[PDB]
């Protein structure tokens, strides 16, 4: 039907625009430098970690929850301990870091603008593998539910499905027309939707290797900055530019609502692991939590 | 009392007026990611010179929109590159994110240009100045940039041209004055006087 989600909470402690976030508590990375670990229910700022490099581009929360990673145009992925000084500084890239995610408490995968995805390790800071091939620079990746595979979206009209253990690609999907800057797996682990600069979320299927659906509407002509499925995957919350977010019916390819209330561009649109509520970043320095 | 620390953080953040540096490889970027914080007139600027990133700039330029002003240093003796530089300026003027922020333009290597002209663009034949030859070439290049500067989006932001040699040391005062003017214009804009 029609979804009428409304602002359950508003977190407004950041000094300037925010660039990313990630659920567990709720971490959020700013431009001023602070990397604040917000409280979701009480809204109290549990931690306010300053950063050596003001220019952040991402942030991660390991599933164990003991570490937090962040990196930006400095090219250095700084990993901090929360049990609050820097634990390590992974440094092997030649371009800005766009997205980093934790496989476990021992290693992290990074997606730099060097047209490569590195598979770092926390113990010694050495690239266990270096996935490469995408002609353009990566902008966003997403680990599979099993963690044995991870997909990455390049600035070319392409995406890839690298395997962490093997160290080699498995498939390539080039159904887009412009840059890819958002991906999130289907919760089952056999398909994934990729937002793009051409303003068309497209859902590729791994088993079939084809674009099953294309969430294209002629009315909207503004690019996508984030995508995210819900718990069951029926909904597809896509965070467009033009200061709005749209929820698509993932199967019917039909519109089902709107999330609005931002005075500037959206830059991350994650959801809770349990699916009890969704979050949303913003360039207005205003995290929001809808439900 | 995290808010207590965040208040001092707000004071420190608003105290520092950021910048950005952009130009060609041969252009004199150094003479005017690398961070170089410097203070003038008891106010601290914290500029940035991004050099480690690849040449594709449609990806990380978008996250330099809170900058107070972009410094654009341009070679003004390498004619072959000049057109390319102009195109870069176009892509900075017309962007949907960098529309608000102004640009401070430096035309580096004026002494080299004088030496070259004393010893590509067909519009130069039908051009007049707004020793004569060197000033004609300088002001022609300046007008070539200002034409695209004032072609569109004049109200939201304005460009500040400057001629800088490779030996002068007055750049800090020039950028200080330009930043003061820019902040004054934003303050007037928020008051609807302009």
């Amino acid at each position, epitope marked *: 039907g029609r979804i009428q989600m409304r602002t359950r909470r508003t977190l407004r402690g950041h000094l300037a625009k925010i660039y990313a976030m990630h659920w567990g508590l709720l971490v959020s990375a700013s431009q001023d430098g602070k990397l604040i670990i917000w409280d979701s229910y009480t809204t109290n700022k549990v931690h306010a970690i300053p950063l050596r490099s003001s220019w952040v581009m991402t942030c991660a929360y390991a599933p164990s929850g003991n570490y937090v990673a962040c990196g930006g145009l400095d090219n250095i992925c700084s990993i901090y301990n929360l049990k609050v000084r820097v634990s390590r500084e992974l440094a092997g890239h030649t371009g800005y870091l766009s997205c980093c995610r934790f496989l476990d408490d021992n290693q992290i995968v990074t997606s730099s603008g060097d*047209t490569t995805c590195a598979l770092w390790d926390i113990e010694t800071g050495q690239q266990t593998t270096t996935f490469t091939g995408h*002609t*353009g620079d990566v902008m966003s990746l997403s680990l599979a539910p099993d963690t044995r595979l991870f997909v990455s979206g*390049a*600035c*070319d*009209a392409s995406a890839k499905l690298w395997d962490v253990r093997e160290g080699m690609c498995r498939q390539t999907f*080039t*159904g*887009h*027309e*412009s*840059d890819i800057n958002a991906i999130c797996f289907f919760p089952n682990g056999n398909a994934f939707a990729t937002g793009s*600069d*051409d303003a068309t979320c497209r859902l590729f299927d791994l088993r079939a290797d084809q674009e099953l659906m294309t969430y294209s509407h002629d009315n909207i*002509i503004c*690019g996508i900055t984030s995508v995210s499925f819900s718990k069951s995957g029926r909904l597809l919350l896509a965070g467009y530019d033009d200061f709005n977010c749209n929820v698509w019916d993932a199967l019917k390819a039909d519109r089902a609502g709107v999330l609005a209330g931002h005075d500037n561009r959206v830059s991350c649109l994650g959801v809770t692991d349990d699916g009890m509520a969704v979050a949303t970043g913003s360039w207005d320095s205003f995290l929001k939590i809808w439900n | 009392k995290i808010e207590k620390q965040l208040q001092k953080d707000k004071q420190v953040y608003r105290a520092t007026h950021r910048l950005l540096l952009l130009g060609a490889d041969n252009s004199g970027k150094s003479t005017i990611i690398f961070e170089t914080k410097f203070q003038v007139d008891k106010v601290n600027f914290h500029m940035f010179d991004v050099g480690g990133q*690849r*040449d*594709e*700039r*449609r990806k990380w*330029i978008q996250c330099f929109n809170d900058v107070t002003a972009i410094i654009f240093v341009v070679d003004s003796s390498d004619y*072959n590159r000049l*057109q*390319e530089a102009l*195109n870069l300026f*176009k*892509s900075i003027w*017309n*962007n*949907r994110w960098l529309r608000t922020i102004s640009v401070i333009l430096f035309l580096n290597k004026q002494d080299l240009l004088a030496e070259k002209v004393l010893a*590509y*663009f*067909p*519009e130069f034949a039908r051009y007049t100045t707004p020793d004569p030859r060197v000033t004609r070439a300088k002001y022609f290049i300046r007008d070539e940039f200002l034409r695209i500067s004032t072609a569109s989006g004049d109200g939201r932001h304005y460009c500040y041209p400057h001629f800088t040699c490779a030996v002068d040391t007055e750049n800090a005062r020039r950028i200080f004055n330009d930043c003061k003017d820019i902040i004054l214009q934003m303050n007037l804009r928020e008051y609807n006087l302009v």
Partner: nanobody
Amino acid sequence: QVQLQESGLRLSCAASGFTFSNYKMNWVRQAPGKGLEWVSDISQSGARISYTGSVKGRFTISRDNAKNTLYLQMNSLKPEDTAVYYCARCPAPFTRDCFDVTSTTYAYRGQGTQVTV
């Protein structure tokens, strides 16, 4: 699969896999032994046209959206015009800026025409 062909004086460019009308188009030449150079541009409607200063008024650029083709009409070629001509695409639709048309490793251009007079 965004793929741009090339042929060819009257240089011709065929584009496939995307809507031709939305994206601005450019001709850029890689001269032999030096970096790339931008040769001319044409927008969606064809109203706004511009060329490098060297080739001002000598070449002529025109696009047929119905056939989804682009054409550059080179007249009175000079030996300084020898180069490899590429048919580059603006990287986003409905925008007045093309940021990386002259990048060394751009993704939305593919061609080769070793023009030599």
